[PDB]
Amino acid sequence: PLCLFICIILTAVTVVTTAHHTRLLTAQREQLVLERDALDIEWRNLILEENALGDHSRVERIATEKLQMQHVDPSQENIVV
Amino acid sequence: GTRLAGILFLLTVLTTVLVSGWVVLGWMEDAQRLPLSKLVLTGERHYTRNDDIRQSILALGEPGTFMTQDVNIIQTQIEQRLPWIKQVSVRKQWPDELKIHLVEYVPIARWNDQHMVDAEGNTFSVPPERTSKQVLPMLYGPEGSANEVLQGYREMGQMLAKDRFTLKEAAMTARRSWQLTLNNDIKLNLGRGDTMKRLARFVELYPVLQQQAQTDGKRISYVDLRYDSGAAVGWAPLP
Amino acid sequence: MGKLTLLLLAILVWLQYSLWFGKNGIHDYTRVNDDVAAQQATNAKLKARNDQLFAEIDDLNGGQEALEERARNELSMTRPGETFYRLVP
């Protein structure tokens, strides 16, 4: 009967609902690949900034200014498992 | 004779449901337009006082009445006024009675010495007057790390409690470095490295430490384990 | 019962077909939604990894605790008055 004409509009408004959220999700997926790429570039630059600060010749220079001393073998108590 | 009495019987049964319905309809109009003032608190309450729910309800203004008071507005106001409420569900009924169900947060530790954490990592706050009776481990960390530090406490605690140590405080930095505080203010300065491997090194090295501590008559101040297969020990005098 | 009920049905099934197998359809939703799910899950771990290193950098300048951990873990330097112990298997 025409009761299926109700079911047609019900599936029609279902299509426009799906087509809107999918079109909304693809725009979000495209934003996430830009975020992933932006994260890796930030990650690479951070590693290079760590090598500069985590240099042993630099660390030893500031740690000696922090009143520290190299490991001395005599003043070293040893324990066996 | 029969239909004569039957019609009279018809009207009598008719008239008596009309006037009696007229009575109960008046019994409800004088009842459904009264501001409900009976509330009942179902659920195990440990921090909510009875006055807490009361002053937080009437803080909105006039109580209203039945069919004019919204549920989702009352259960919402409770959640913001009482931050230690996990689940709240307010209900109504034909008379003047307000069913309110409460589910509270069970604190397992303190969060930055201000708020608290439960066993599932949820964060919440409680006024300090109602929890000063509890001895609780004091956890620290960045803003969102509430559940992450809790995983570290339960893992490092069970290793320390296995050798009869009490992990009083456990702090994590935003760079994920760890400082543990044990009983009698000895500080374990872990690092971003193998905290589980460095902590197990301490419980194996501890019996040697207290020997020279009492040999030289000194109290252990801190134990820095930011090494590999090693540890630097600080000292302090005793009172 | 006839073309008044059959023509109304052949359009509904073409609408059901275009809903599941169709541009921006149900199967397009499921596939894209799974991608968006796994992406932000991966980006969450990456951001956590980057924020942690950012904290290390933010402490290596204008701070000492992250520098002092490198002064001990990598150069074995100890402070004066700290009795150094070492564990051997």
Author numbering:
A (entry chain L): 39 to 119
B (entry chain Q): 22 to 260
C (entry chain B): 1 to 89
Can you list sentences taken from the study reporting this PDB entry?
The essential membrane protein complex of FtsB, FtsL and FtsQ (FtsBLQ) is at the heart of the divisome assembly cascade in Escherichia coli. A core complex at the heart of this machinery is composed of three type-II bitopic membrane proteins, the Filamentous temperature-sensitive proteins B, L and Q (FtsB, FtsL, FtsQ).
The crystal structure of the FtsBLQ complex was determined at 3.1 Å resolution by molecular replacement using the partial structure of the complex as the input model, which contains the periplasmic domain of FtsQ and the C-terminal region of FtsB (PDB: 5Z2W18). The other branch comes from FtsQ that adopts a rod-like shape, with two globular periplasmic domains arranged linearly and connected to the TM helix α1 in a slightly bent manner. The crossing point of the two branches, however, is not at the very tip but somewhere in the middle of the continuous FtsBL coiled coil, forming an included angle of ~37°, where an interface between FtsB and FtsQ is revealed. Therefore, the two rigid periplasmic branches of FtsBLQ form an obtuse triangle with the plane of the membrane (49 Å and 70 Å in length and at ~37° angle) and are connected to the bendable FtsQ-TM and the unbendable FtsBL-TM on each side. In Site I, a heterotrimeric β-sheet is revealed for the first time in the FtsBLQ complex, involving three C-terminal β-strands, FtsLE115–V118, FtsBE83–P88, FtsQS250–W256. The tightly bent short helix of FtsB-α3 is sandwiched by the short helix of FtsL-α2 and the β domain of FtsQ, forming an extensive hydrogen-bond/electrostatic interaction network which involves the FtsB-FtsQ interface near the C-terminus of the coiled coil. Therein, FtsBE56 serves as an interaction hot spot, bringing together the β8-β9 and β10-α6 linkers of FtsQ, the α3 helix of FtsB, the α2 helix of FtsL, and the C-terminal region of the coiled coil.
